[PDB]
Amino acid sequence: AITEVECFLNPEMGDPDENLRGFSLKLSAENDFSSDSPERKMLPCYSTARIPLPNLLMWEAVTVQTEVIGITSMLNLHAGSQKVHEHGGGKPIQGSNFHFFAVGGDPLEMQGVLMNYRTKYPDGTITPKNPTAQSQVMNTDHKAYLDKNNAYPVECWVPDPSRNENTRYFGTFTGGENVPPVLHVTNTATTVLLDEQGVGPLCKADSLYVSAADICGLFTNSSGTQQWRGLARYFKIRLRKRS
Amino acid sequence: VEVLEVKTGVDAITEVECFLNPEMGDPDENLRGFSLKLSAENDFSSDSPERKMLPCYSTARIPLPNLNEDLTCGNLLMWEAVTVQTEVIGITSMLNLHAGSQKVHEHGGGKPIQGSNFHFFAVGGDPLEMQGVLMNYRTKYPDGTITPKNPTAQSQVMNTDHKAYLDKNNAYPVECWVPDPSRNENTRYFGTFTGGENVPPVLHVTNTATTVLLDEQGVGPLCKADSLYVSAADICGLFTNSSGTQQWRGLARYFKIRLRKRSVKN
Amino acid sequence: VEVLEVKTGITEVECFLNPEMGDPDENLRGFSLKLSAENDFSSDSPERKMLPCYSTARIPLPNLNEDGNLLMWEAVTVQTEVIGITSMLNLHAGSQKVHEHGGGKPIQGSNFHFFAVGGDPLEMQGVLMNYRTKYPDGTITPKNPTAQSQVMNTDHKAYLDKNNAYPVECWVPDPSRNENTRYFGTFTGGENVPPVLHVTNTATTVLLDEQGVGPLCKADSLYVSAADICGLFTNSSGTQQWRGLARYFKIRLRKRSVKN
Amino acid sequence: VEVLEVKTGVDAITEVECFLNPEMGDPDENLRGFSLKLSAENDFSSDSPERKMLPCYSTARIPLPNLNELLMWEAVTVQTEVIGITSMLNLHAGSQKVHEHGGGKPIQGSNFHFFAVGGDPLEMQGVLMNYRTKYPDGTITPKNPTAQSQVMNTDHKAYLDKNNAYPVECWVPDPSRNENTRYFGTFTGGENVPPVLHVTNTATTVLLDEQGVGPLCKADSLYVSAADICGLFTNSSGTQQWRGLARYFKIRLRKRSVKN
Amino acid sequence: EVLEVKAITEVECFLNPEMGDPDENLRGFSLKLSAENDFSSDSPERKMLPCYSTARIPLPNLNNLLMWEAVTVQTEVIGITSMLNLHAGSQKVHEHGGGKPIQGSNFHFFAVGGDPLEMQGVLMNYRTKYPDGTITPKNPTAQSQVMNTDHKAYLDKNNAYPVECWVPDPSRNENTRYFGTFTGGENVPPVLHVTNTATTVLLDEQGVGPLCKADSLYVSAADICGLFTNSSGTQQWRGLARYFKIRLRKRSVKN
Numbered sequence A: 001a002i003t004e005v006e007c008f009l010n011p012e013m014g015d016p017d018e019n020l021r022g023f024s025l026k027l028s029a030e031n032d033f034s035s036d037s038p039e040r041k042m043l044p045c046y047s048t049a050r051i052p053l054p055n056l057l058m059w060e061a062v063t064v065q066t067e068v069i070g071i072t073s074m075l076n077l078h079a080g081s082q083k084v085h086e087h088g089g090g091k092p093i094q095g096s097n098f099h100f101f102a103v104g105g106d107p108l109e110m111q112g113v114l115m116n117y118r119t120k121y122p123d124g125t126i127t128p129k130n131p132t133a134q135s136q137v138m139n140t141d142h143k144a145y146l147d148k149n150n151a152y153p154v155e156c157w158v159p160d161p162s163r164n165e166n167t168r169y170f171g172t173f174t175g176g177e178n179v180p181p182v183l184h185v186t187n188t189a190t191t192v193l194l195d196e197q198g199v200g201p202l203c204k205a206d207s208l209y210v211s212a213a214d215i216c217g218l219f220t221n222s223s224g225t226q227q228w229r230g231l232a233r234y235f236k237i238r239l240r241k242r243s
Numbered sequence B: 001v002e003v004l005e006v007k008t009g010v011d012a013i014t015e016v017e018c019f020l021n022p023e024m025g026d027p028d029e030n031l032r033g034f035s036l037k038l039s040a041e042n043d044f045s046s047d048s049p050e051r052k053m054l055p056c057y058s059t060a061r062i063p064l065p066n067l068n069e070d071l072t073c074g075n076l077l078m079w080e081a082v083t084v085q086t087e088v089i090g091i092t093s094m095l096n097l098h099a100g101s102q103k104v105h106e107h108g109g110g111k112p113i114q115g116s117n118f119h120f121f122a123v124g125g126d127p128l129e130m131q132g133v134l135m136n137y138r139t140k141y142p143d144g145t146i147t148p149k150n151p152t153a154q155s156q157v158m159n160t161d162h163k164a165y166l167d168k169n170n171a172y173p174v175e176c177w178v179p180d181p182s183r184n185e186n187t188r189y190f191g192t193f194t195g196g197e198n199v200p201p202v203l204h205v206t207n208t209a210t211t212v213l214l215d216e217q218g219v220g221p222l223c224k225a226d227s228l229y230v231s232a233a234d235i236c237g238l239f240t241n242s243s244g245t246q247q248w249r250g251l252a253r254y255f256k257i258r259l260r261k262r263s264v265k266n
Numbered sequence C: 001v002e003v004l005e006v007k008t009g010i011t012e013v014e015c016f017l018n019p020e021m022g023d024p025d026e027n028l029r030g031f032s033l034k035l036s037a038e039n040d041f042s043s044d045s046p047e048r049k050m051l052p053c054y055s056t057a058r059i060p061l062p063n064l065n066e067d068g069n070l071l072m073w074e075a076v077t078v079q080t081e082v083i084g085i086t087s088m089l090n091l092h093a094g095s096q097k098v099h100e101h102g103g104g105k106p107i108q109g110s111n112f113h114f115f116a117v118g119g120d121p122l123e124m125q126g127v128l129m130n131y132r133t134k135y136p137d138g139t140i141t142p143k144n145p146t147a148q149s150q151v152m153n154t155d156h157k158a159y160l161d162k163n164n165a166y167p168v169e170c171w172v173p174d175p176s177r178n179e180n181t182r183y184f185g186t187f188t189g190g191e192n193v194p195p196v197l198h199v200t201n202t203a204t205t206v207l208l209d210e211q212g213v214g215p216l217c218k219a220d221s222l223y224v225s226a227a228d229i230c231g232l233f234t235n236s237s238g239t240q241q242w243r244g245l246a247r248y249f250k251i252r253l254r255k256r257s258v259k260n
Numbered sequence D: 001v002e003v004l005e006v007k008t009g010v011d012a013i014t015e016v017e018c019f020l021n022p023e024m025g026d027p028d029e030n031l032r033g034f035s036l037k038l039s040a041e042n043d044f045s046s047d048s049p050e051r052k053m054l055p056c057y058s059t060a061r062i063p064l065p066n067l068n069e070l071l072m073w074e075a076v077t078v079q080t081e082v083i084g085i086t087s088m089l090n091l092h093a094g095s096q097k098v099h100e101h102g103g104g105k106p107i108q109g110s111n112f113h114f115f116a117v118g119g120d121p122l123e124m125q126g127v128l129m130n131y132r133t134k135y136p137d138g139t140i141t142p143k144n145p146t147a148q149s150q151v152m153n154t155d156h157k158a159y160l161d162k163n164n165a166y167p168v169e170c171w172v173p174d175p176s177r178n179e180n181t182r183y184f185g186t187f188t189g190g191e192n193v194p195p196v197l198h199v200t201n202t203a204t205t206v207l208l209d210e211q212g213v214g215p216l217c218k219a220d221s222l223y224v225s226a227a228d229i230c231g232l233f234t235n236s237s238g239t240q241q242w243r244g245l246a247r248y249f250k251i252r253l254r255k256r257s258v259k260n
Numbered sequence E: 001e002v003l004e005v006k007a008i009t010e011v012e013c014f015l016n017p018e019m020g021d022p023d024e025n026l027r028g029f030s031l032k033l034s035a036e037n038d039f040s041s042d043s044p045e046r047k048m049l050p051c052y053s054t055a056r057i058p059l060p061n062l063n064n065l066l067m068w069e070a071v072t073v074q075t076e077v078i079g080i081t082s083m084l085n086l087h088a089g090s091q092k093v094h095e096h097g098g099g100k101p102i103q104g105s106n107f108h109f110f111a112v113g114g115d116p117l118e119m120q121g122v123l124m125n126y127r128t129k130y131p132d133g134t135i136t137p138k139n140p141t142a143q144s145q146v147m148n149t150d151h152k153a154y155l156d157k158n159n160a161y162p163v164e165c166w167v168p169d170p171s172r173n174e175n176t177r178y179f180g181t182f183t184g185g186e187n188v189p190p191v192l193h194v195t196n197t198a199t200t201v202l203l204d205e206q207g208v209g210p211l212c213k214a215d216s217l218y219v220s221a222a223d224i225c226g227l228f229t230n231s232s233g234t235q236q237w238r239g240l241a242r243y244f245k246i247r248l249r250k251r252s253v254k255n
């Protein structure tokens, strides 16, 4: 018939200690391209989960409702953030952000692209193998499945528009020092996942795949150090049985 | 609050109007609509915000006329919310640049209200259901607030323990709580957060705009126990005092909700 | 009144409504007095010429009757735009240079663009930044304000019944009234907000409600109201003045039958 | 004046194309498409802008295939875009470095993008920042302006009947006239406003009014008007000049029967 | 003379950006920008000038003739998340802060047609002396700073036509569809969307797509994302590759 699955997917911003869940390690700056060795806890990664479905005929994903969870937490301007001026409140989270989700019946297919092909990525990350200068533009060698939570750095990977026949994905990147976060919540908004032929993602092995990245911006500490802040994403997916 | 019978009968329409005041903190009797001045740079390990500094969600339960003559029959009637017209009241008050605000430069006018803002409303037949999320799980929240109980590091992302009903006016801090998209089957909610030091407030008014509250099946919120719930948060931005201190500024929200009678089984 | 059918077998009225920014001298029409800053809430006594006010005009219409069914003028559509937006491309006159050897500073900052069309004067609700503000002679402002006047105080009800008298900072259109008026406004606040203004003669606003009924000129009068604060002009001295522009209205009306 | 049916058949449809060059002031033989460097901080009582500092409206009359005297050419659609937007990616020539060792400063700041298509010259209304501005020989500006010229003065009516003569800062399209023209403009003011310009050959603006009637070409003439001030160019010295670009028009016309 | 639709093929392509590539390690970047060259002595180096990207995709030789007709395109910019690397090379925003994001003037442009993209030349400075290896407006005058109808070119060579010299020509391109947005300014934030759910229809008002004249499909792009600011304060253009997926069908025509 029809079934609904829901999930809250936690962000994977780096979590530099047991208290700073949802933040990255402070950002380094001005590393030469030839000596760029980022620490694991400084690198936000894609979130993903496989949701098992009742077995029989295949589950077909028809609609998704999704939103970013805890957007009002950024109205805490009393904790940790640099004052905007003498006697002023804390600096809001602002700057470069990326909001991305995907729903599919297979893992999200990703293409690798690097700012700096010579970056030395740390143990525990999965990044483009044997990168060249061409890895800074399009290098068709860099193909991956988003098949591990907290492993694929957001800065290394994008959804692959040449694949993903069985996934729908949506993402917006906004770059800049002072970019304001703009986030909407409503339980009245639905994305239809049906393609031009009226067919949604088909859950291959009774598995539904949800993927996210919600880098909200940079938190500026009193010291001037900066950390990424991320938030969880909710998914509610309606499925129907197809032959 | 005005509950008006626009039409009687089977095709009965009722319109409920109300002005929900903001709950920005009100640090003294003269600064209604404003918070206490903001502190800054508290370590996560010693973050003890004062009550009057924390904007809270506004909410009211509006009782409706009882529809069920005899409680012992196959079909009962319930009020169904079909549309809402809503706007923020007093947006032009921010054109007062002569009172209290820091000059933008030598010989200049006062600094406009600007910076992080949040505009939110909900209409439902049950209390708004909220999920807790914290900037800093170690924040020590003051007496008179209701905040996530026994928070952990997971409370900075998603901790499913932090479930609450917006069941008290001027108590749930906006920074601790969001509407819960996993619940609220019987509420419609809408909110926009815009963060940043210099974000301009952008506010529209018109008596020509209506939000339809009907779901995919053409059913609006159904008023359980003859109760309509309105909720709001309208943090317009930060007011900068001549000293350089900053206070949140909030404004009241108007609601006009059109309801009709729906028959349901017992 | 009970509304019947549209009479078949249309007229258009137009008006240019001047802004009321304060007009501090005979040469500065369209500007306010220089803005004061940092007045304590307890001693805030703004000068009349510093306070932009709502603009309004009544357009008289011919009565349609002689004697069960009467005729009334019904407003169906309005075309409206702000007049003189290109005047802000004058960066040579009076404005502070943006830097050494540069052109003048554009008008920018907080702006408010508002219009209403109705068959009754616009109904307004009072809200104050500072309830203790002492408003000057010649203004009409909320009577006996309290701290609650900084949020919603239902005592503060007015008719926009005088041109150049109701300060924009004290009054908003009242969404709890205005049964017989349509209003539209946008406030954009901030030091450096860029003005964004569109002109086109191809845009029409429909004034018909859900039942297909426009404002009814019950007393053979049509009411137009405006506020168009474009932003702040920064003088070479560093002083700032509000700048306002006129608004054009073209309203299409038809005859509507109503029950006596 | 009375509009009847669209006439079809062979040669009942025509398309005209044209490029309108911008008229930014052209301060010397090499600086076509730029203004003279901007002055700043002139007192309102002593504001004497040089001709070459004042961008003006562009306009042209396009003759159409002669029809006799009744059929008229009716403008149905226009495709239009600004030409040469990528020229602003030259940050090596003339522009002030953004900081030590940086590239040149992009063109940015106040901009105005405007076009009109009609069967009569564009009708304009005059509005001035400063009524006391002394406009130079070779410009056509509001005649005998008063303080009221800073808001709405109904005396200031003109036809856009001369290319490179009507300063953009003095004139706007008149919404009270232009029955037989369709115009569209956006003003964006501010020091740091980014230019945002779109190109595509797939986008069409429909010129038909509510009754399905386009501009009707009196005397087999089509009128195109433009102003495309893209922003300010900042020289290494800090001096600023307006930069303008040409506008392309492709207009589709059909034959319409009317009566006299 | 276009007759009935007669079946379907799909071509896909990744078009690399041509930002200047100042050395073998800085593929996708330009040479550092010069500033404040007088209009009378403006001699930009080749590797400082982003150029239009283009490729001709040969299609099966179908020959009343049949021609391949382009019906839809799906396109997006590839690698937008690479700009979240604020640890490599970029100037700190302040003491102890992270690197400065890529920002400033950007241009995002694509075209699909059955002929080479037709371009019109327009120059900031007609006196610019363009370097060997570029194709720029021939015999420019002051009118070349506004509209000079002499400056007509085909985008017929990859990495040769500087973006700053050329725009798509709206007076031609009968057999091409093009789309571009320019956003100018020092601190403009890049805003880029990805989704595999967006399709652009290439059919004109008569329901006819670009017709592949000599069994050739033409894709063109420019995706200048903004300026990268080095620790030193020097700036370089950053560009990204563009993906195309084009659906074609067979169309009967007279001849």
Ligand SMILES: CC(=O)N[C@H]1[C@H]([C@H](O)[C@H](O)CO)O[C@@](OC[C@H]2O[C@@H](O[C@H]3[C@H](O)[C@@H](O)[C@H](O)O[C@@H]3CO)[C@H](O)[C@@H](O)[C@H]2O)(C(=O)O)C[C@@H]1O
Pocket (backbone or CB within 6 Å): D027, D028, D031, D035, D036, D037, D094, D235, D236, D237, D238, D239, D241, E038, E039, E040
């Ligand atoms: C892009 C550009 O040309 N920039 C120059 C700029 C402009 O020419 C003017 O501002 C336009 O009004 O002029 C700057 O120098 C100002 C002097 O210009 C002299 O003209 C020169 C011009 O500068 C040279 O580029 C050109 O080769 O020769 C012209 C004639 O000798 C005027 O004669 C003089 O009165 C000044 O106004 C400036 O900084 O504004 C120089 C810019 O490089």
Ligand SMILES: CC(=O)N[C@H]1[C@H]([C@H](O)[C@H](O)CO)O[C@@](O)(C(=O)O)C[C@@H]1O
Pocket (backbone or CB within 6 Å): B027, B031, B035, B036, B037, B100, B241, B242, B243, B244, B245, B247, C040, C041
């Ligand atoms: C009346 C008003 O609007 N602002 C006043 C504030 C607020 O009352 C408090 O900040 C509330 O916490 O207090 C001051 O001491 C300050 O912070 O500079 C003086 C200032 O005039």
Ligand SMILES: CC(=O)N[C@H]1[C@H]([C@H](O)[C@H](O)CO)O[C@@](O)(C(=O)O)C[C@@H]1O
Pocket (backbone or CB within 6 Å): A032, A033, E022, E026, E030, E031, E032, E089, E230, E231, E232, E233, E234, E236
């Ligand atoms: C990303 C990168 O490695 N950039 C380097 C650049 C570029 O190689 C050139 O600017 C190309 O023209 O050169 C520098 O000397 C500089 O400009 O400060 C050092 C800098 O680290």
